[PDB]
RNA sequence: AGGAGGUAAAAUUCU
RNA sequence: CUUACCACUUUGUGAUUCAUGACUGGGGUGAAGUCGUAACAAGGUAACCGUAGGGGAACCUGCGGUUGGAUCACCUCC
RNA sequence: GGCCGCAAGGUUAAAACUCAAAUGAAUUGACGGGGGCCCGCACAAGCGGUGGAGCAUGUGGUUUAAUUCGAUGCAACGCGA
């Protein structure tokens, strides 16, 4: 529009949508499991998807996915939470990291087990 | 006459309380409480029916809870049946006894949970109080149709009270120890 | 060959 | 010793702002529940906008406004 | 929140939250309780039937130790036989 308009009300710029208030923009926060749900995924998919509600460090009560075949944790559990999302089940916005300070890693992983905190068989 | 609604009022009441007892059975306290699982929807290989018809819902301690079973080819089949059922119980497949732990009263549990039972208690009272309302509506009604004597009314309007009062005592004192399972 | 006026009543649904 | 300045603090009374609240209002989302069928074909009463009054619910009804509206074949007369 | 209204409400005007769509015009079909035109024992016009009855035969269900398997609107059911 007018230059005389732009001068008067200059060009706006969208700001941070941030899809993950891990408050201080942190790569991960530490939290306690409020509880450990199971809920069912969005439309075309069907499963029992494992998950936990987690108070962390900064006051935020949130809710995170716990992935991999077979996890083990309960109330007492302090987990480490990292930025994440699951397309099914829209509630989510967060993934629990496997092999951080309490939840443990996946039983009997070999492929891609950096991602599930698993020590090597015996190399 | 009064007779067959004095006994009618009565059954409706002490079966009112035996729903409360029944719905403060589906809560999770600290304590083991096997009647927690002993009212859970579960599938297995043909038809519903609870796990009553399969495993012994026993104990290991106040804070844990063994599941002695017969058949070891449905351990995951029920595990999911239990571990997706509005409780929040992750069962360990330590083998043999599906170890279901009892995570502690987290204080935001000693409270707010407690608030639920003494609310569920209250509505159980209200139901009773309303059996009351009816019971003697029938009384009051069959009076203004001259089939009772004022006296016979009065002695029936109370005594219906005696039924409410006692029936509440059961609600209240069944709640009261159930409160100890956290306080 | 224009205009005119009158000609179908109601009747749902499909992991 | 006193006088002036003045920090801390005090009383009243407004303002402003963040967190919190029984309860409560809608909103969002969640494969297979319950009602009816409002809309899209003329959607079987054209729809829709503003407004107002009704109603389990989609909605219905009046007042104006918009096309972002489907149909001219058969008849009797001219 | 401000301003305006007797009210109904009007005006200025966000946020958390959620989705990977939402939208426009045109295209090809398909549909319409849209319209035009036209066919077929489709109606209409007629003749004799099933549906009732007994029996033959098939099928569903029920039964059974078994009542072997298949065919299920038109286009399965005197069909594979
Ligand atoms: N989803 C958006 C909203 O949907 C609303 O409609 C809500 C309900 O009407 C609708 O419920 C539908 C029901 O309408 C439909 N006729 C039958 C269906 N079983 C229900 O489904 C609902 O419940 C089932 C299980 O109970 C859930 O799996 C599913 O997430 C949910 N859609 O689900 C919607 C909410 O999930 C309104 N259309 C409106 O407020 C808004 O558009
Ligand atoms: Mg229809
Ligand atoms: Mg229906
Ligand atoms: Mg609500
Ligand atoms: Mg309709
Ligand atoms: Mg209409
Ligand atoms: Mg109108
Ligand atoms: Mg012919
Ligand atoms: Mg004929
Ligand atoms: Mg015949």
Describe the structure.
The structure is cut from a larger assembly and holds chains A (123 residues) and B (183 residues). By secondary structure, chain A is mostly beta strands. Helices cover 3% and strands 26% of the residues of chain A. In chain A, strands 1, 2, 3, 4, 5 and 6 form a six-stranded antiparallel β-sheet that branches. Chain B has helices at 3-14, 17-23, 75-83, 113-144, 150-180, and strands at 55-57, 64-65, 67-69, 100-101. By secondary structure, chain B is mainly alpha-helical. Chain B has two domains: 2-30 and 106-183, Ribosome-recycling factor (Topoisomerase I, Chain A, domain 4); 31-105, Gyrase A, domain 2 (2-Layer Sandwich), CATH 3.30.1360. In chain B, strands 1-3 form a two-stranded antiparallel ribbon. A two-stranded antiparallel sheet of chain B has the order 2-4. The longest helix of chain B has 32 residues, at 113-144. The interface between A and B is small, with 11 and 10 residues. Bound molecules: paromomycin and magnesium ion (9 copies). Chain A binds three RNA strands through loops. It is classed as ribosome. The entry lists the keywords Protein biosynthesis, ribosomes, paromomycin, antibiotic translocation, RNA, tRNA, transfer, exit, peptidyl, 30S, 70S, 16S, ribosomal subunit, ribosome.
